[PDB]
């Protein structure tokens, strides 16, 4: 029952209830918590996630410590969620020198030589992407965003790992389609999330008993689906494809290679149509950054030119509408660390096993930091205006060795859908469409409403 952890240390915060600590006041949100909690208790707080004492810090000093510095020796672990069971083996999941064996043997696969290869594989579609979304326009009625980019990045992570061309919009039954279409971002605010973040005790039951917080339908399908294909469907010698390449210290397992497969499936599906969704809310309110950005596109690329990965990188305010979004619409919300060893950063002091916790949502909402940070202007992120801006500030793919693995290749995707789409296709706001849009209050950074806009084709 540590809850005068912070009345010790004299670090401030809310005020716990026994057993519950501080999950009354997410009522809100996670967002809207952390940037409460950061105007009223300044720079260092703490609050309480049931038992667990979870300390908030904002100085960039004290984040490049916490993410860069001591990271390999202090702040190396992430913090421990419900019953992970046999998916303990992937990366983001995976702790101490066990992360260290999957990050060296993974890092190879993220590299731009190999990012290049992989370049003409989700080009295809996004000429499907531009084929469907050519229809939903011919009719005039409103565009769901999430189902058309959802689709669009269903596709793009199946191709990149082995074959399977399957049309995801087109084919919604298919075994592989309909299995990781499952795949449900874990919401922290939900009943089941909070009963365990407030009783951590049932996680070892719920461990005994095969209770998995990945669904097992999924977890058996995509196992079995990666042996067939590694052996059965290409037995004849000449991202899976560069992880069997692979298999200091090696010893790949084939357990832990299933592992690595769905968490790529599950971070690239929801997260790549949630930010594109988000992007194209913002081309459309403000039709003079979408004009500006199709000028752009059509200079580097005349004639409806297909896109190339030299390409993508020469796009100067492609790269500035796409970082102002994830500024606004961080998706991962907080960047946590959990403290192995009682040390101290920067004069302030950490105990032990305390959740050291970076507020991106409200880092990068801070007045002291950004001008104007509620209104969507892309030129801060101009060559002129680029110096302003600390990286420890924002951090849409976090910092450090355990930072974002496919950052590269989720900007590479995105920004590769945004030239098809932005080259045959106008974006305007809908008559049903959220003005200003409100996010949600759950343990999920997206729309209250999903984003619906009237989709005009340029010159049919
Ligand atoms: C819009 C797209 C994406 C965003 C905004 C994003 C953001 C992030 C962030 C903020 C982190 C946490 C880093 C930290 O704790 O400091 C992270 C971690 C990670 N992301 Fe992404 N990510 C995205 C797409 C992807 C994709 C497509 C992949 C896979 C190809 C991926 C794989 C990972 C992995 C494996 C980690 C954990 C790294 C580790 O513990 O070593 N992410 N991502
Ligand atoms: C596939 O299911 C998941 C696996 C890991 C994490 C995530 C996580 C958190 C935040 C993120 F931002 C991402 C993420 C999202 C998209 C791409 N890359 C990483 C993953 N990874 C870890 N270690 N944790 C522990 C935690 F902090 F208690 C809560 N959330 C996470 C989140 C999910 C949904």
């Known amino acids: 029952h540590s809850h005068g952890l912070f009345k010790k240390l004299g670090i401030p915060g809310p005020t716990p209830l026994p057993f519950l600590g501080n999950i009354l006041s ?10 409460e909690c950061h105007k009223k208790y300044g720079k260092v707080w703490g609050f309480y996630d049931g038992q667990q004492p979870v300390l908030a810090i904002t100085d960039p000093d004290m984040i490049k410590t916490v993410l860069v510095k001591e990271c390999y020796s202090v702040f ?6 419900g019953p992970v069971g046999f998916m303990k083996s992937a990366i983001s999941i995976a702790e101490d020198e066990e992360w260290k064996r999957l990050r060296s043997l993974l890092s190879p696969t993220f590299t731009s030589g190999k ?26 009625k409103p565009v769901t965003l999430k189902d058309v980019f959802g689709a669009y990045s269903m596709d793009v992570i199946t191709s990149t790992s082995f074959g399977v061309n399957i049309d995801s919009l087109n084919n919604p039954q298919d075994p592989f389609v309909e299995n990781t279409k ?8 939900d009943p089941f999330f909070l009963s365990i973040t407030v009783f951590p005790f049932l996680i070892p039951i719920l461990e005994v008993l095969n209770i998995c917080v990945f669904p097992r339908e999924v977890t058996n399908f995509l196992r079995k689906s990666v042996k067939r294909m590694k052996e059965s469907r290409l037995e004849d010698t000449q991202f899976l494809q560069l992880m069997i390449d692979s298999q200091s210290h090696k010893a790949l397992s084939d357990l832990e290679l299933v592992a690595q497969s769905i968490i790529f499936i599950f971070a690239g599906y929801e997260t790549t149509s949630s930010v594109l969704s988000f992007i194209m809310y913002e081309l459309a309110t403000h039709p003079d950054v979408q004009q500006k950005l199709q000028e752009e596109i059509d200079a580097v690329l ?106 590269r290749f989720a900007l590479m995707n995105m920004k590769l859908a945004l030239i098809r789409v932005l080259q045959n296709f106008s974006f305007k706001p809908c008559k049903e469409t959220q003005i200003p849009l409100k996010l949600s209050l759950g ?11 009237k989709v005009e084709s340029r010159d049919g």
């Open 182 to 189: 499952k795949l449900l971002r874990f919401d922290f605010l």
């Open 76 to 81: 190396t672990n992430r913090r421990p969620f």
């Open 443 to 453: 343990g999920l950074l997206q729309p209250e409403k999903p984003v619906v806009l």
């Open 302 to 407: 005349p004639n409806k030119a297909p896109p190339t990965y030299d390409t993508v990188l020469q796009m100067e305010y492609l790269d500035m509408v796409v970082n102002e979004t994830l500024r606004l619409f961080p998706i991962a919300m907080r960047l946590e660390r959990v403290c192995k060893k009682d040390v101290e950063i920067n004069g302030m002091f950490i105990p032990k096993g305390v959740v050291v916790m970076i507020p991106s949502y409200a880092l990068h909402r801070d007045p002291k930091y950004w001008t104007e940070p509620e209104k969507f202007l892309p030129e801060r992120f101009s060559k002129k205006n680029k110096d302003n801006i600390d990286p420890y500030i924002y951090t849409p793919f976090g910092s450090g060795p355990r930072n974002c693995i496919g950052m």
């Open 26 to 35: 997410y009522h809100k949100g996670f967002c809207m918590f952390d940037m």
């Open 115 to 140: 990012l290049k290869e992989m370049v003409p594989i989700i080009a295809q579609y996004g000429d499907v992407l531009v084929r469907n979304l050519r229809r939903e326009a011919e009719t005039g």
